[PDB]
Symmetry: C2
C-alpha cells in the first residue's frame, strides 16, 4: 500500500477562473513530472483569495460556486485518474456556509466531504464570521488509495482531531492550509510561527503512527478593506512526514509541485515499536470533554 | 514577574542506590552554587536506581522498600537548598502493589504532591507493566510555591491527552522525568529518528497548550543483568526545556550535565491570546477520544 502524493502549492491568480485553470495546468504538469502520482492535495480554499482577511458579507457570493467547483475538480480527477482533494466553500443553505474539503475518487465520484471543525478568529483571519463549524465530526474518508484522515487548516493545531481520525482507521493525516505572516512580524516570530506549525503536525504523525501531508498557498494578498497594511504573506512550505515525524518532502515558499512517496505499511511496524494506542489511559480521558477545569 | 529558575540534574546511575543519591546531592549542591536563583530542580526518572525494567525479575520489588527513606532523603535536600524538588521514586503502595511515583517537595521539604505514572510501557528491555501498577489518581497538577506543576513521568510524554488535561486543570508548566535510550541493534538513522521524535512530540504539547515544558533524562550505558539484551541500553541524556511556543530555551548534551533555564510563566497569557486553541476546541465532538479504537 503506497501513496504517491502530489501537492500543488501556488498563489491565487486574481480571479476564480484563472486560479482554477492554473491549478489544472499544475496538475497536468505534476502528473507528467511524477507519473506514479495517485493522490493530489490542493491548498485550502484553492479557487479563491483568502477572503477571511476582512469581515465582509459580500464574500458569501463566492459560496454560489460550490457545485461548479466540484464539477470542475471532479472532471480533473477523472481526466488524470487520481484521487484529488479540493478545499472548497460550501453553501449549506441560504445564509449557512462551511469550509468544506471534497475528495474526488479517480473516476470523478465524490468519495467524501469534510467540514472544517475548528474555526479560527483573529484580525486578518475572521473565519468564524463566514464558516459555520462542521457538524459531521472527525470522520475519515475512504478512497482507493487509503482511508484519509482529512481535516482543514486550523484543525491541524488540535491533537484531539488527529487522534479521533486515527481511532477511526485513518491511514494518513491531511491538512490543506492557508497560513502566512503579517508585515508587522519579525524574522524571529516568522521562523517560530512556521516551525511551530510544522512541529505540532509532526507530533500528530508520531502520536498516531501515521504519515501526514500539510499543504499551503504562497504569495502576498492584500486586504481589500485596507485595514491590514501589507496584507498576508503566505509562506508555502507544504510538507510531508512519515509515521515517526521524519520529513519525506519539504517545499520552498514559492510556487511548487511537491512530491513524496508514502509507505502506509510502515504504520504496523511503527506501532509495534511504539504501541501508544494500546496504552492510552482512556479510563482517565473524560476531562478532555471540558472547556476548562 | 512569575519566573521559574529550573535546574535539571542529568547523570548516570552510580552502581548503588547510596552512591547515586549522594551523587545527585553533590550535583544539586553544584547547581545551586552555579545558579543561585534556582527555585525548581527536576531529577531524572527513577533517579536513585538503575533502569531496572530492562529485565523482568521480581527481586527488583525489593527496591520498593526504600520509598520512605528516599522521600526523607530528597525532602531533606529540598529543605537544605530551599528549592522545589521533583524526585522520581518507586512506591510500594501495599504488598504486591507498586507504582512509578514522582514526588514534589516544597522548599520546606514538605510533600506538595505525588504523581503515579499513568501510561505504563511494555517493550523488550522496557518491561514496565510487570512492575508498575498504572496510576489511579489521574492527571492532576501539583500546586507549589513556584507554580502549578503539570508533572507526569516518561512514557506519559507521548500522549497529547495527558498534557491537555493538565493544561485544562491550570498547569503552568509541563514536566517529564524520563529514562530513554537506544539499543545496540539500532542504526544511527533510527537512533536519530527516535530522539528527534521524543523531543518533537513534547514540543507539540507545549505548543498545543501554550505552556513551557521540561523533559529530563539520564545518561550512561546500562547492561541487562539477565544478559538477554546484548549491549544494554545507552541513555542519551539530551534533557531540554522549551517555552510556550515550542521554542528551545535550553538543551543538554548526552553526558552528565546540570541544565539551567529561566522560564517566564507570564508568557502564557500573550501566547494564548495569539493562539487561542483552548477557546476553539470542539469539545462537543471529542467524545470518541474515550474509545480504545473505532
Amino acid at each position: 500500500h503506497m501513496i504517491y502524493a502530489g501537492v500543488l502549492q501556488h498563489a491565487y491568480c486574481g480571479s476564480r477562473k484563472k486560479t482554477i485553470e492554473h491549478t489544472a495546468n499544475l496538475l497536468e504538469q505534476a502528473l507528467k513530472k511524477h507519473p506514479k502520482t495517485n493522490l493530489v492535495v490542493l491548498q485550502e480554499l484553492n479557487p479563491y483569495s483568502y477572503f477571511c482577511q476582512s469581515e465582509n458579507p459580500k464574500f458569501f457570493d463566492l459560496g454560489e460556486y460550490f457545485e461548479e467547483d466540484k464539477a470542475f475538480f471532479s472532471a480533473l480527477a477523472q481526466k488524470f485518474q487520481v484521487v484529488l482533494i479540493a478545499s472548497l466553500f460550501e453553501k449549506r443553505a441560504k445564509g449557512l456556509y462551511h469550509n468544506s474539503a471534497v475528495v474526488f475518487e479517480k473516476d470523478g465520484s465524490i468519495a467524501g466531504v469534510y467540514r472544517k471543525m475548528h474555526i479560527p478568529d483573529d484580525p486578518g483571519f475572521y473565519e468564524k464570521f463566514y464558516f459555520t463549524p462542521g457538524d459531521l465530526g472527525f470522520e475519515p474518508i475512504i478512497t482507493s488509495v487509503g482511508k484519509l484522515g482529512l481535516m482543514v487548516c486550523w484543525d491541524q493545531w488540535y491533537p484531539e482531531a488527529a487522534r479521533i481520525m486515527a481511532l477511526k482507521g485513518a491511514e494518513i493525516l491531511i491538512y490543506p492550509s492557508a497560513i502566512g505572516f503579517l508585515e508587522e512580524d519579525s524574522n524571529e516570530e516568522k521562523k517560530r510561527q512556521q516551525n511551530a506549525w510544522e512541529t505540532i503536525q509532526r507530533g500528530h504523525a508520531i502520536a498516531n503512527g501515521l504519515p501526514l501531508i500539510a499543504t499551503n498557498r504562497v504569495g502576498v494578498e492584500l486586504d481589500p478593506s485596507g485595514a491590514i497594511k501589507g496584507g498576508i504573506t503566505f509562506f508555502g512550505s507544504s510538507f510531508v512526514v512519515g509515521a515517526l515525524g521524519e520529513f519525506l518532502a519539504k517545499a520552498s515558499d514559492k510556487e511548487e509541485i511537491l512530491y513524496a512517496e508514502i509507505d502506509l505499511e510502515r504504520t504496523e511496524e511503527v506501532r509495534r515499536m511504539w504501541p501508544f494506542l494500546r496504552d492510552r489511559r482512556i479510563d482517565f480521558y473524560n476531562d478532555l470533554l471540558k472547556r476548562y477545569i
